[PDB]
């Protein structure tokens with residue numbers, strides 16, 4: 367068992383916004399992504415616009431100040447740090463991708479569900495139905511659901 371948050375109230379802040387999408391659409395994607403995980407754990411997430419958030423959400427390009435440099439369009443879409451102070455928990459999205467609300471480019475909501483998985487302490491899954499599977503492939507946003515493996519994983523960490 368890797369690191370977990372030692373509390374059930376977790377804040378997040380959106381550090382900056384991709385110009386690919388409407389600001390409102392980014393907020394919505396991120397809030398809905400947290401809700402996916404809140405729905406199956408005791409965890410609650412609140413957005414703050416100021417103060418010290420646990421999970422910072424960042425859009426950045428290439429070498430962006432950590433040891434997980436991005437690679438331009440394609441390849442790595444995002445990465446996130448597991449639970450911990452400071453950079454711990456933070457989720458970084460590669461601005462060289464084209465973020466969308468839909469099936470074109472890279473869907474932000476789906477990517478955020480996967481990354482928040484990491485921010486909460488999950489690693490990758492070999493279950494092809496799992497949101498924690500290593501590779502992205504668009505699935506209908508309206509019928510999207512965590513797989514049994516994702517739920518097992520997160521319930522083993524919290525609750």
Ligand SMILES: NC(=O)[C@H](CCC(=O)O)NC(=O)[C@H](CCC(=O)O)NC(=O)CCc1ccc(-c2ccccc2)cc1
Nearest residue numbers: 441442443444476477480496497499500501502503505
């Ligand atoms: N399929 C790919 O290879 C895409 C390219 C973009 C595309 O094909 O549209 N890149 C990626 O998949 C890279 C690969 C990194 C590697 O190991 O080197 N992975 C990442 O960047 C991890 C982020 C990630 C993984 C899975 C999902 C997802 C989406 C819907 C349902 C279930 C899971 C969302 C986000």
Ligand SMILES: [Ca+2]
Nearest residue numbers: 420452453454
């Ligand atoms: Ca943090």
Ligand SMILES: [Ca+2]
Nearest residue numbers: 438440442460
């Ligand atoms: Ca990339």
Ligand SMILES: [Ca+2]
Nearest residue numbers: 386461463464
């Ligand atoms: Ca972009």
Ligand SMILES: [Zn+2]
Nearest residue numbers: 430432434458
């Ligand atoms: Zn980073």
Ligand SMILES: [Zn+2]
Nearest residue numbers: 480484490500
């Ligand atoms: Zn991942």
